Amino acid sequence: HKILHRLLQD
Amino acid sequence: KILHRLLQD
Amino acid sequence: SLALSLTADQMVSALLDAEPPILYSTRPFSEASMMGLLTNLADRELVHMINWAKRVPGFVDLTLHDQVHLLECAWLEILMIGLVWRSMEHPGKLLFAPNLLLDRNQGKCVEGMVEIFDMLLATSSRFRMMNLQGEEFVCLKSIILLNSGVYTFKDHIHRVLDKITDTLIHLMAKAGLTLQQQHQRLAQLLLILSHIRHMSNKGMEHLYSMKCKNVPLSDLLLEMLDAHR
Amino acid sequence: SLALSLTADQMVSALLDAEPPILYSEYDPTRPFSEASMMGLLTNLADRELVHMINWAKRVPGFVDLTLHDQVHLLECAWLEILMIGLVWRSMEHPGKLLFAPNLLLDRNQGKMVEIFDMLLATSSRFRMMNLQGEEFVCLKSIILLNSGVKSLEEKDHIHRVLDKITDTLIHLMAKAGLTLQQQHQRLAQLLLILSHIRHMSNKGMEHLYSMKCKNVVPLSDLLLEMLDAHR
Ligand SMILES: CC(C)Cn1nc2c(C(F)(F)F)cccc2c1-c1ccc(O)cc1O
Ligand SMILES: CC(C)Cn1nc2c(C(F)(F)F)cccc2c1-c1ccc(O)cc1O
């Protein structure tokens, strides 16, 4: 997984 | 330079 | 997609509204001090950029994986065009932040940095001699986000891009430019994106060198960097 | 000058007949592959194209108006971009294939190189869907030559005038083709956005063939070693 996946997700 | 002379010619 | 139904002036407003703020950062010389400051700044900016991108019309309509791809591909270009924009009123200066203005004499002390500093300063002057407008700037930014990774992999993105082109023209027209001046300015603006891409690639390389040559890098910064490998 | 005093039709005319020839590779199907040897084919092909590109650049309106040092700079900066867009143009009618030469058609299934391949393939696919025309292609190619690398630096202003000139030619071409104003503007942008992708492929490739050099394997003509070195 990746941090970008999370931040964009929000 | 090779390019320099080529440009001259 | 909502973006396609927006009017030119609605489009311009949404972009202005999604605009991230100008963040704040000891005259930096040496790799450590300069890169410590530059990375920290970029770290915080990336969080704003991400939430900015989510407010660019059409972007949200893409799958998460596609959003991730475009961000990974364009992040440094978007940081650089912002930097260049901020530096317009400061000839020979790079305004990384209101409290951090560097000139080329500081890039000189960092191996393989001055060349990129010079490139950024040149683009900044170019923007300036063109009287680049803020509304124009935001349009270029969205274009970079959507275009840079569109061929790195479609219809949707291309139409939204066309939409943005309509918006740029609309703006120049609203500014009183003639038809000829419109397509000439349009071309000039877009020709600079090629240079923006160039500075990003050379910068990305410089960073890989910095990474392997080990300043500490955030995990986010590390992931964005590895995306370009 | 003369470049500045040309009609759009004269401009398109100049560029068209200034076009370089399509060269053949040394590819031989009866001969075994090899990453190194297959690279030898590409470098050899590219090296011979450069000599033609050098003489093509001289016939790009307003290019010879520049000092030699500025001509060298522009070439050093754009050489690979120009080879790649020429390559992409040659491969338009060959979906999933890259036509390096009439006797050398390659698909992504070959190379060590695939990533850059897909970028070129994607670009060529872009030309097809846009139905890019030859007249438009020669304009894009001359724009790259003048744009990619742009005191007495009044040469910069001269390059810009020529660039504005070519922009008018593009619009002139689209208009005569029957496009509405909106369609012209849009198509102009679409073409210019592609140049950004060409710059990218150039930089990726440049960093790649830099390794090949250091990797001490593939032969590089002293001209390629020069051009490459310009980017380091
Ligand atoms: C520090 C890095 C994550 C971002 N960065 N990098 C820059 C470079 C170079 F290291 F690639 F050479 C040169 C010039 C600016 C660079 C930036 C950068 C750009 C914009 C910004 O707002 C903050 C930055 O650190
Ligand atoms: C071999 C080099 C001088 C030129 N080159 N390199 C290419 C690459 C890569 F090695 F960078 F990966 C990928 C695809 C094409 C490449 C070319 C090349 C481009 C156009 C052309 O007419 C001939 C070429 O060898």
Side-chain angles (χ1 to χ4, degrees), chain A, chain B, chain C residues 1-30 32-88 90-110 112-153 155-204 206-207 209-210 212 214-228, chain D residues 1 3-32 34 36-111 113-150 152 155-156 158-175 177-206 208-215 217-232:
Chain A
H1 305 84
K2 304 196 296 298
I3 304 176
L4 190 49
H5 285 318
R6 182 170 61 76
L7 298 179
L8 271 167
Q9 200 153 346
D10 301 339
Chain B
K1 273 182 180 174
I2 299 181
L3 173 48
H4 185 242
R5 56 187 272 2
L6 292 185
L7 276 169
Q8 280 185 338
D9 289 312
Chain C
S1 177
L2 178 88
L4 275 31
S5 292
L6 299 176
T7 57
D9 280 310
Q10 290 170 341
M11 181 68 62
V12 174
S13 273
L15 289 182
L16 292 178
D17 197 48
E19 186 71 3
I22 297 178
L23 307 186
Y24 281 80
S25 180
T26 180
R27 300 279 285 334
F29 295 85
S30 74
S33 291
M34 177 182 299
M35 300 317 300
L37 297 172
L38 266 53
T39 56
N40 179 274
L41 174 56
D43 259 315
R44 286 175 284 126
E45 286 188 281
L46 276 169
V47 182
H48 287 270
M49 178 191 302
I50 292 178
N51 289 275
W52 156 82
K54 285 153 67 176
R55 295 164 76 179
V56 174
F59 187 82
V60 168
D61 303 309
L62 301 175
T63 70
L64 180 65
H65 289 271
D66 290 327
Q67 296 177 28
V68 164
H69 180 82
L70 301 184
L71 244 18
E72 286 179 346
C73 181
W75 70 271
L76 188 51
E77 297 179 67
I78 292 172
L79 289 180
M80 285 183 169
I81 191 177
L83 169 57
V84 168
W85 165 254
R86 302 197 292 270
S87 307
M88 286 185 55
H90 305 265
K93 301 271 189 299
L94 293 175
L95 193 155
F96 285 87
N99 62 345
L100 190 61
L101 278 71
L102 314 186
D103 64 23
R104 63 187 315 275
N105 295 335
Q106 282 166 292
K108 292 169 53 183
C109 300
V110 177
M113 177 67 67
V114 67
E115 300 73 347
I116 307 183
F117 269 22
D118 288 335
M119 291 183 288
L120 296 159
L121 291 170
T123 314
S124 183
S125 303
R126 178 59 177 170
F127 275 8
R128 190 182 171 280
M129 298 307 304
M130 290 187 59
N131 299 280
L132 180 65
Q133 297 298 297
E135 303 80 343
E136 293 180 314
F137 163 71
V138 291
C139 287
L140 290 182
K141 203 173 160 193
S142 296
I143 287 182
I144 292 178
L145 176 66
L146 292 169
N147 176 70
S148 293
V150 75
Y151 298 152
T152 60
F153 305 70
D155 184 331
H156 174 252
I157 284 179
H158 286 335
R159 284 181 299 184
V160 175
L161 280 169
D162 284 343
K163 185 64 164 53
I164 300 179
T165 305
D166 297 337
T167 304
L168 282 175
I169 293 299
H170 170 88
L171 291 168
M172 307 174 188
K174 170 177 289 188
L177 275 55
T178 64
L179 276 25
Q180 189 179 59
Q181 291 171 338
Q182 293 179 29
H183 64 63
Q184 286 191 348
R185 183 171 184 86
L186 178 62
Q188 294 166 356
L189 292 175
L190 299 177
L191 281 188
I192 295 173
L193 300 195
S194 178
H195 303 118
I196 290 297
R197 180 75 70 117
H198 189 54
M199 294 180 294
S200 176
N201 295 329
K202 292 309 179 189
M204 205 66 65
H206 181 75
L207 293 173
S209 180
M210 188 190 72
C212 203
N214 199 94
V215 120
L217 285 175
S218 63
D219 294 328
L220 175 59
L221 234 17
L222 235 109
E223 289 188 342
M224 305 297 292
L225 203 66
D226 283 333
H228 288 261
Chain D
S1 175
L4 294 167
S5 231
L6 295 176
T7 65
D9 284 323
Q10 290 174 337
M11 177 65 64
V12 175
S13 189
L15 299 182
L16 286 176
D17 75 46
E19 201 70 342
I22 295 178
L23 308 186
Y24 282 83
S25 87
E26 290 53 27
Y27 173 81
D28 175 5
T30 57
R31 186 173 297 271
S34 174
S37 65
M38 178 55 64
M39 285 307 306
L41 293 178
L42 297 180
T43 63
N44 173 264
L45 177 60
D47 175 77
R48 286 179 287 120
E49 285 175 286
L50 282 175
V51 186
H52 285 270
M53 182 195 300
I54 291 180
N55 295 273
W56 158 86
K58 292 165 157 178
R59 297 189 55 187
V60 171
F63 184 82
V64 286
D65 301 328
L66 313 169
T67 63
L68 296 181
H69 277 257
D70 294 325
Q71 292 178 337
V72 166
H73 176 94
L74 291 177
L75 251 342
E76 295 179 357
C77 295
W79 72 272
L80 184 55
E81 280 187 81
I82 295 185
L83 293 182
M84 284 185 169
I85 193 175
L87 169 53
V88 171
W89 168 256
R90 300 199 296 269
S91 308
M92 273 189 61
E93 39 288 316
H94 303 86
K97 263 74 111 165
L98 290 179
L99 187 152
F100 287 89
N103 64 348
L104 181 52
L105 264 69
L106 294 177
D107 56 88
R108 55 123 37 198
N109 299 21
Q110 312 180 45
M113 178 71 61
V114 69
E115 192 176 84
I116 297 181
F117 262 45
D118 290 326
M119 286 182 290
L120 297 161
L121 293 172
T123 310
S124 179
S125 177
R126 176 54 168 171
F127 288 3
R128 277 196 301 278
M129 299 298 73
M130 281 186 57
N131 190 22
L132 181 63
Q133 300 297 297
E135 294 78 356
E136 295 177 306
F137 161 75
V138 293
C139 284
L140 289 135
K141 194 162 66 174
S142 66
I143 286 176
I144 294 178
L145 177 60
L146 294 170
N147 180 50
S148 296
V150 64
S152 175
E155 319 295 345
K156 185 181 170 63
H158 173 67
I159 300 181
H160 287 134
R161 293 178 180 84
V162 173
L163 277 171
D164 285 344
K165 233 293 189 301
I166 306 174
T167 296
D168 295 346
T169 301
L170 275 180
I171 293 296
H172 179 264
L173 285 167
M174 299 178 180
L179 280 61
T180 60
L181 238 306
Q182 184 174 358
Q183 292 180 323
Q184 299 178 26
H185 296 343
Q186 292 178 342
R187 184 172 188 81
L188 179 62
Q190 295 168 337
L191 292 180
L192 299 186
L193 286 188
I194 302 302
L195 305 200
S196 182
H197 294 270
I198 299 295
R199 172 83 74 152
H200 188 73
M201 292 180 298
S202 176
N203 294 137
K204 305 314 301 177
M206 202 69 66
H208 179 80
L209 73 116
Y210 166 81
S211 300
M212 301 319 178
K213 184 186 73 66
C214 295
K215 197 142 297 182
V217 61
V218 185
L220 283 188
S221 63
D222 294 24
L223 177 57
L224 253 35
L225 301 177
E226 281 200 6
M227 307 294 294
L228 169 63
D229 197 38
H231 282 253
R232 300 296 153 176

PDB file of all heavy atoms in Angstrom, chain D residues 39 42-43 45-46 49 79-80 83-84 87 90 100 113 116-117 120 205-206 208-209 220 224, ligand 2:
ATOM      1  N   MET D  39      20.602  -3.229 -29.275  1.00  0.00           N
ATOM      2  CA  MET D  39      20.894  -1.841 -28.942  1.00  0.00           C
ATOM      3  C   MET D  39      21.868  -1.240 -29.946  1.00  0.00           C
ATOM      4  O   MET D  39      21.778  -0.059 -30.281  1.00  0.00           O
ATOM      5  CB  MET D  39      21.456  -1.726 -27.524  1.00  0.00           C
ATOM      6  CG  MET D  39      20.417  -1.899 -26.432  1.00  0.00           C
ATOM      7  SD  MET D  39      19.002  -0.804 -26.654  1.00  0.00           S
ATOM      8  CE  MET D  39      19.815   0.788 -26.767  1.00  0.00           C
ATOM      9  N   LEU D  42      19.963   0.208 -32.752  1.00  0.00           N
ATOM     10  CA  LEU D  42      19.313   1.478 -32.452  1.00  0.00           C
ATOM     11  C   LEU D  42      20.301   2.644 -32.428  1.00  0.00           C
ATOM     12  O   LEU D  42      20.033   3.702 -32.997  1.00  0.00           O
ATOM     13  CB  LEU D  42      18.555   1.395 -31.127  1.00  0.00           C
ATOM     14  CG  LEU D  42      17.399   0.393 -31.088  1.00  0.00           C
ATOM     15  CD1 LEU D  42      16.722   0.400 -29.725  1.00  0.00           C
ATOM     16  CD2 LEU D  42      16.394   0.695 -32.189  1.00  0.00           C
ATOM     17  N   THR D  43      21.438   2.448 -31.766  1.00  0.00           N
ATOM     18  CA  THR D  43      22.458   3.489 -31.680  1.00  0.00           C
ATOM     19  C   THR D  43      23.033   3.805 -33.056  1.00  0.00           C
ATOM     20  O   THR D  43      23.199   4.971 -33.419  1.00  0.00           O
ATOM     21  CB  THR D  43      23.605   3.089 -30.735  1.00  0.00           C
ATOM     22  OG1 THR D  43      24.265   1.924 -31.246  1.00  0.00           O
ATOM     23  CG2 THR D  43      23.070   2.796 -29.343  1.00  0.00           C
ATOM     24  N   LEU D  45      21.567   3.299 -35.955  1.00  0.00           N
ATOM     25  CA  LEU D  45      20.498   3.970 -36.682  1.00  0.00           C
ATOM     26  C   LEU D  45      20.394   5.434 -36.265  1.00  0.00           C
ATOM     27  O   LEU D  45      20.297   6.326 -37.109  1.00  0.00           O
ATOM     28  CB  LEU D  45      19.165   3.259 -36.439  1.00  0.00           C
ATOM     29  CG  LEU D  45      17.919   3.877 -37.075  1.00  0.00           C
ATOM     30  CD1 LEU D  45      18.053   3.926 -38.588  1.00  0.00           C
ATOM     31  CD2 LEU D  45      16.673   3.103 -36.670  1.00  0.00           C
ATOM     32  N   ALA D  46      20.420   5.672 -34.958  1.00  0.00           N
ATOM     33  CA  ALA D  46      20.302   7.023 -34.420  1.00  0.00           C
ATOM     34  C   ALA D  46      21.476   7.902 -34.840  1.00  0.00           C
ATOM     35  O   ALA D  46      21.296   9.071 -35.180  1.00  0.00           O
ATOM     36  CB  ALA D  46      20.188   6.979 -32.904  1.00  0.00           C
ATOM     37  N   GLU D  49      21.019   9.057 -38.315  1.00  0.00           N
ATOM     38  CA  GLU D  49      19.918  10.012 -38.384  1.00  0.00           C
ATOM     39  C   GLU D  49      20.364  11.402 -37.942  1.00  0.00           C
ATOM     40  O   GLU D  49      19.918  12.409 -38.491  1.00  0.00           O
ATOM     41  CB  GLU D  49      18.743   9.548 -37.522  1.00  0.00           C
ATOM     42  CG  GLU D  49      17.950   8.401 -38.117  1.00  0.00           C
ATOM     43  CD  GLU D  49      16.883   7.890 -37.172  1.00  0.00           C
ATOM     44  OE1 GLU D  49      17.242   7.216 -36.184  1.00  0.00           O
ATOM     45  OE2 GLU D  49      15.689   8.166 -37.411  1.00  0.00           O
ATOM     46  N   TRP D  79      17.968  16.850 -29.609  1.00  0.00           N
ATOM     47  CA  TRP D  79      18.282  15.761 -30.535  1.00  0.00           C
ATOM     48  C   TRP D  79      17.457  14.486 -30.317  1.00  0.00           C
ATOM     49  O   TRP D  79      16.919  13.925 -31.271  1.00  0.00           O
ATOM     50  CB  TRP D  79      19.785  15.453 -30.562  1.00  0.00           C
ATOM     51  CG  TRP D  79      20.315  14.774 -29.337  1.00  0.00           C
ATOM     52  CD1 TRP D  79      20.784  15.372 -28.206  1.00  0.00           C
ATOM     53  CD2 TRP D  79      20.453  13.361 -29.133  1.00  0.00           C
ATOM     54  NE1 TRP D  79      21.198  14.421 -27.304  1.00  0.00           N
ATOM     55  CE2 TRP D  79      21.005  13.181 -27.848  1.00  0.00           C
ATOM     56  CE3 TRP D  79      20.159  12.235 -29.907  1.00  0.00           C
ATOM     57  CZ2 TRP D  79      21.268  11.916 -27.322  1.00  0.00           C
ATOM     58  CZ3 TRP D  79      20.423  10.981 -29.382  1.00  0.00           C
ATOM     59  CH2 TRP D  79      20.971  10.833 -28.103  1.00  0.00           C
ATOM     60  N   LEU D  80      17.347  14.036 -29.071  1.00  0.00           N
ATOM     61  CA  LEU D  80      16.618  12.802 -28.787  1.00  0.00           C
ATOM     62  C   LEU D  80      15.105  12.984 -28.892  1.00  0.00           C
ATOM     63  O   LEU D  80      14.394  12.081 -29.332  1.00  0.00           O
ATOM     64  CB  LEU D  80      16.996  12.238 -27.415  1.00  0.00           C
ATOM     65  CG  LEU D  80      16.359  10.888 -27.072  1.00  0.00           C
ATOM     66  CD1 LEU D  80      16.655   9.860 -28.154  1.00  0.00           C
ATOM     67  CD2 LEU D  80      16.830  10.393 -25.712  1.00  0.00           C
ATOM     68  N   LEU D  83      14.261  12.680 -32.563  1.00  0.00           N
ATOM     69  CA  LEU D  83      14.319  11.301 -33.031  1.00  0.00           C
ATOM     70  C   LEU D  83      13.068  10.547 -32.595  1.00  0.00           C
ATOM     71  O   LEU D  83      12.515   9.751 -33.353  1.00  0.00           O
ATOM     72  CB  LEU D  83      15.567  10.594 -32.496  1.00  0.00           C
ATOM     73  CG  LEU D  83      16.925  11.080 -33.005  1.00  0.00           C
ATOM     74  CD1 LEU D  83      18.044  10.246 -32.403  1.00  0.00           C
ATOM     75  CD2 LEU D  83      16.979  11.034 -34.523  1.00  0.00           C
ATOM     76  N   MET D  84      12.625  10.813 -31.371  1.00  0.00           N
ATOM     77  CA  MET D  84      11.489  10.105 -30.789  1.00  0.00           C
ATOM     78  C   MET D  84      10.149  10.482 -31.415  1.00  0.00           C
ATOM     79  O   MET D  84       9.274   9.631 -31.570  1.00  0.00           O
ATOM     80  CB  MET D  84      11.442  10.312 -29.274  1.00  0.00           C
ATOM     81  CG  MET D  84      12.470   9.492 -28.515  1.00  0.00           C
ATOM     82  SD  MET D  84      12.300   9.639 -26.729  1.00  0.00           S
ATOM     83  CE  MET D  84      13.390   8.324 -26.184  1.00  0.00           C
ATOM     84  N   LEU D  87      10.149   8.945 -34.747  1.00  0.00           N
ATOM     85  CA  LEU D  87       9.848   7.535 -34.543  1.00  0.00           C
ATOM     86  C   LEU D  87       8.353   7.324 -34.338  1.00  0.00           C
ATOM     87  O   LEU D  87       7.752   6.437 -34.945  1.00  0.00           O
ATOM     88  CB  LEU D  87      10.621   6.994 -33.338  1.00  0.00           C
ATOM     89  CG  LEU D  87      10.207   5.611 -32.835  1.00  0.00           C
ATOM     90  CD1 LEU D  87      10.221   4.598 -33.970  1.00  0.00           C
ATOM     91  CD2 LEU D  87      11.109   5.162 -31.697  1.00  0.00           C
ATOM     92  N   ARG D  90       6.468   7.764 -37.521  1.00  0.00           N
ATOM     93  CA  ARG D  90       6.658   6.631 -38.423  1.00  0.00           C
ATOM     94  C   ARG D  90       5.803   5.431 -38.023  1.00  0.00           C
ATOM     95  O   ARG D  90       5.491   4.580 -38.855  1.00  0.00           O
ATOM     96  CB  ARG D  90       8.132   6.217 -38.475  1.00  0.00           C
ATOM     97  CG  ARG D  90       9.075   7.303 -38.968  1.00  0.00           C
ATOM     98  CD  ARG D  90      10.406   6.723 -39.429  1.00  0.00           C
ATOM     99  NE  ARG D  90      11.154   6.080 -38.351  1.00  0.00           N
ATOM    100  CZ  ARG D  90      12.048   6.702 -37.589  1.00  0.00           C
ATOM    101  NH1 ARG D  90      12.303   7.989 -37.778  1.00  0.00           N
ATOM    102  NH2 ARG D  90      12.688   6.038 -36.635  1.00  0.00           N
ATOM    103  N   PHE D 100      11.167   1.695 -36.159  1.00  0.00           N
ATOM    104  CA  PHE D 100      12.478   2.334 -36.145  1.00  0.00           C
ATOM    105  C   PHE D 100      12.994   2.472 -37.569  1.00  0.00           C
ATOM    106  O   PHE D 100      13.737   3.400 -37.890  1.00  0.00           O
ATOM    107  CB  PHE D 100      13.469   1.518 -35.312  1.00  0.00           C
ATOM    108  CG  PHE D 100      13.229   1.596 -33.832  1.00  0.00           C
ATOM    109  CD1 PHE D 100      12.377   0.701 -33.206  1.00  0.00           C
ATOM    110  CD2 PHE D 100      13.861   2.561 -33.066  1.00  0.00           C
ATOM    111  CE1 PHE D 100      12.157   0.771 -31.842  1.00  0.00           C
ATOM    112  CE2 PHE D 100      13.646   2.635 -31.701  1.00  0.00           C
ATOM    113  CZ  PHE D 100      12.793   1.740 -31.089  1.00  0.00           C
ATOM    114  N   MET D 113      13.846  -1.437 -21.449  1.00  0.00           N
ATOM    115  CA  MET D 113      13.462  -0.662 -22.618  1.00  0.00           C
ATOM    116  C   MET D 113      11.947  -0.592 -22.774  1.00  0.00           C
ATOM    117  O   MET D 113      11.420   0.325 -23.407  1.00  0.00           O
ATOM    118  CB  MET D 113      14.077  -1.295 -23.869  1.00  0.00           C
ATOM    119  CG  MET D 113      13.719  -0.601 -25.166  1.00  0.00           C
ATOM    120  SD  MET D 113      14.524   1.000 -25.328  1.00  0.00           S
ATOM    121  CE  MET D 113      16.248   0.515 -25.297  1.00  0.00           C
ATOM    122  N   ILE D 116       9.869   2.752 -21.686  1.00  0.00           N
ATOM    123  CA  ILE D 116       9.952   3.834 -22.660  1.00  0.00           C
ATOM    124  C   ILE D 116       9.202   3.462 -23.936  1.00  0.00           C
ATOM    125  O   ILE D 116       8.586   4.313 -24.577  1.00  0.00           O
ATOM    126  CB  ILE D 116      11.414   4.181 -22.998  1.00  0.00           C
ATOM    127  CG1 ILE D 116      12.140   4.687 -21.749  1.00  0.00           C
ATOM    128  CG2 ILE D 116      11.474   5.218 -24.109  1.00  0.00           C
ATOM    129  CD1 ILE D 116      13.581   5.076 -21.993  1.00  0.00           C
ATOM    130  N   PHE D 117       9.261   2.183 -24.296  1.00  0.00           N
ATOM    131  CA  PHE D 117       8.507   1.662 -25.429  1.00  0.00           C
ATOM    132  C   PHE D 117       7.031   2.020 -25.301  1.00  0.00           C
ATOM    133  O   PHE D 117       6.433   2.576 -26.223  1.00  0.00           O
ATOM    134  CB  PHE D 117       8.658   0.142 -25.510  1.00  0.00           C
ATOM    135  CG  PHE D 117       9.696  -0.316 -26.494  1.00  0.00           C
ATOM    136  CD1 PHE D 117      10.941   0.289 -26.545  1.00  0.00           C
ATOM    137  CD2 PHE D 117       9.432  -1.364 -27.359  1.00  0.00           C
ATOM    138  CE1 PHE D 117      11.896  -0.134 -27.449  1.00  0.00           C
ATOM    139  CE2 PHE D 117      10.383  -1.793 -28.264  1.00  0.00           C
ATOM    140  CZ  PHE D 117      11.617  -1.178 -28.309  1.00  0.00           C
ATOM    141  N   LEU D 120       6.278   5.672 -25.933  1.00  0.00           N
ATOM    142  CA  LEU D 120       6.282   5.961 -27.362  1.00  0.00           C
ATOM    143  C   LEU D 120       5.028   5.399 -28.024  1.00  0.00           C
ATOM    144  O   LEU D 120       4.353   6.089 -28.789  1.00  0.00           O
ATOM    145  CB  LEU D 120       7.529   5.369 -28.021  1.00  0.00           C
ATOM    146  CG  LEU D 120       8.873   5.926 -27.551  1.00  0.00           C
ATOM    147  CD1 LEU D 120      10.004   4.976 -27.910  1.00  0.00           C
ATOM    148  CD2 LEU D 120       9.120   7.312 -28.134  1.00  0.00           C
ATOM    149  N   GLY D 205      14.848   8.317 -21.569  1.00  0.00           N
ATOM    150  CA  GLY D 205      15.776   7.657 -22.467  1.00  0.00           C
ATOM    151  C   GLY D 205      17.207   8.102 -22.244  1.00  0.00           C
ATOM    152  O   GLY D 205      18.126   7.284 -22.228  1.00  0.00           O
ATOM    153  N   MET D 206      17.397   9.406 -22.066  1.00  0.00           N
ATOM    154  CA  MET D 206      18.728   9.965 -21.867  1.00  0.00           C
ATOM    155  C   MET D 206      19.407   9.334 -20.655  1.00  0.00           C
ATOM    156  O   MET D 206      20.572   8.938 -20.720  1.00  0.00           O
ATOM    157  CB  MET D 206      18.651  11.484 -21.696  1.00  0.00           C
ATOM    158  CG  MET D 206      19.949  12.206 -22.008  1.00  0.00           C
ATOM    159  SD  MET D 206      20.353  12.146 -23.765  1.00  0.00           S
ATOM    160  CE  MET D 206      19.024  13.133 -24.451  1.00  0.00           C
ATOM    161  N   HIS D 208      18.658   6.538 -19.393  1.00  0.00           N
ATOM    162  CA  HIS D 208      18.795   5.116 -19.671  1.00  0.00           C
ATOM    163  C   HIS D 208      20.066   4.822 -20.461  1.00  0.00           C
ATOM    164  O   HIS D 208      20.903   4.030 -20.031  1.00  0.00           O
ATOM    165  CB  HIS D 208      17.576   4.598 -20.433  1.00  0.00           C
ATOM    166  CG  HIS D 208      17.651   3.142 -20.771  1.00  0.00           C
ATOM    167  ND1 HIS D 208      17.358   2.150 -19.857  1.00  0.00           N
ATOM    168  CD2 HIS D 208      17.992   2.509 -21.917  1.00  0.00           C
ATOM    169  CE1 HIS D 208      17.511   0.971 -20.431  1.00  0.00           C
ATOM    170  NE2 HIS D 208      17.895   1.159 -21.681  1.00  0.00           N
ATOM    171  N   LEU D 209      20.206   5.464 -21.616  1.00  0.00           N
ATOM    172  CA  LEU D 209      21.363   5.226 -22.471  1.00  0.00           C
ATOM    173  C   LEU D 209      22.645   5.739 -21.823  1.00  0.00           C
ATOM    174  O   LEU D 209      23.745   5.467 -22.304  1.00  0.00           O
ATOM    175  CB  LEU D 209      21.167   5.847 -23.857  1.00  0.00           C
ATOM    176  CG  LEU D 209      21.258   7.367 -23.988  1.00  0.00           C
ATOM    177  CD1 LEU D 209      22.442   7.748 -24.863  1.00  0.00           C
ATOM    178  CD2 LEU D 209      19.966   7.930 -24.558  1.00  0.00           C
ATOM    179  N   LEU D 220      28.883   3.264 -28.737  1.00  0.00           N
ATOM    180  CA  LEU D 220      28.339   4.605 -28.918  1.00  0.00           C
ATOM    181  C   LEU D 220      29.273   5.459 -29.764  1.00  0.00           C
ATOM    182  O   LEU D 220      30.421   5.698 -29.385  1.00  0.00           O
ATOM    183  CB  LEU D 220      28.102   5.288 -27.568  1.00  0.00           C
ATOM    184  CG  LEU D 220      26.872   4.860 -26.768  1.00  0.00           C
ATOM    185  CD1 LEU D 220      26.667   5.767 -25.561  1.00  0.00           C
ATOM    186  CD2 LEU D 220      25.644   4.870 -27.657  1.00  0.00           C
ATOM    187  N   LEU D 224      27.345  10.579 -30.457  1.00  0.00           N
ATOM    188  CA  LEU D 224      26.361  10.252 -29.434  1.00  0.00           C
ATOM    189  C   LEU D 224      26.927  10.522 -28.047  1.00  0.00           C
ATOM    190  O   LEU D 224      26.251  11.089 -27.188  1.00  0.00           O
ATOM    191  CB  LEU D 224      25.931   8.790 -29.555  1.00  0.00           C
ATOM    192  CG  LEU D 224      24.526   8.552 -30.111  1.00  0.00           C
ATOM    193  CD1 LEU D 224      24.178   9.597 -31.155  1.00  0.00           C
ATOM    194  CD2 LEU D 224      24.404   7.147 -30.682  1.00  0.00           C
TER     195      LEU D 224
HETATM  196  C1  LIG E   2      20.090   4.398 -28.997  1.00  0.00           C
HETATM  197  C2  LIG E   2      19.817   5.845 -28.585  1.00  0.00           C
HETATM  198  C3  LIG E   2      20.965   6.693 -29.127  1.00  0.00           C
HETATM  199  C4  LIG E   2      18.521   6.337 -29.224  1.00  0.00           C
HETATM  200  N1  LIG E   2      17.261   5.719 -28.703  1.00  0.00           N
HETATM  201  N2  LIG E   2      17.126   5.310 -27.639  1.00  0.00           N
HETATM  202  C5  LIG E   2      15.915   4.799 -27.396  1.00  0.00           C
HETATM  203  C6  LIG E   2      15.340   4.231 -26.289  1.00  0.00           C
HETATM  204  C7  LIG E   2      16.069   4.080 -25.072  1.00  0.00           C
HETATM  205  F1  LIG E   2      17.266   3.463 -25.197  1.00  0.00           F
HETATM  206  F2  LIG E   2      16.337   5.280 -24.517  1.00  0.00           F
HETATM  207  F3  LIG E   2      15.363   3.365 -24.197  1.00  0.00           F
HETATM  208  C8  LIG E   2      13.992   3.788 -26.402  1.00  0.00           C
HETATM  209  C9  LIG E   2      13.290   3.942 -27.614  1.00  0.00           C
HETATM  210  C10 LIG E   2      13.960   4.541 -28.697  1.00  0.00           C
HETATM  211  C11 LIG E   2      15.239   4.948 -28.558  1.00  0.00           C
HETATM  212  C12 LIG E   2      16.118   5.534 -29.377  1.00  0.00           C
HETATM  213  C13 LIG E   2      15.864   5.871 -30.656  1.00  0.00           C
HETATM  214  C14 LIG E   2      14.803   6.759 -30.907  1.00  0.00           C
HETATM  215  C15 LIG E   2      14.517   7.118 -32.241  1.00  0.00           C
HETATM  216  C16 LIG E   2      15.281   6.597 -33.298  1.00  0.00           C
HETATM  217  O1  LIG E   2      14.992   6.956 -34.571  1.00  0.00           O
HETATM  218  C17 LIG E   2      16.347   5.706 -33.062  1.00  0.00           C
HETATM  219  C18 LIG E   2      16.631   5.343 -31.736  1.00  0.00           C
HETATM  220  O2  LIG E   2      17.660   4.481 -31.473  1.00  0.00           O
END
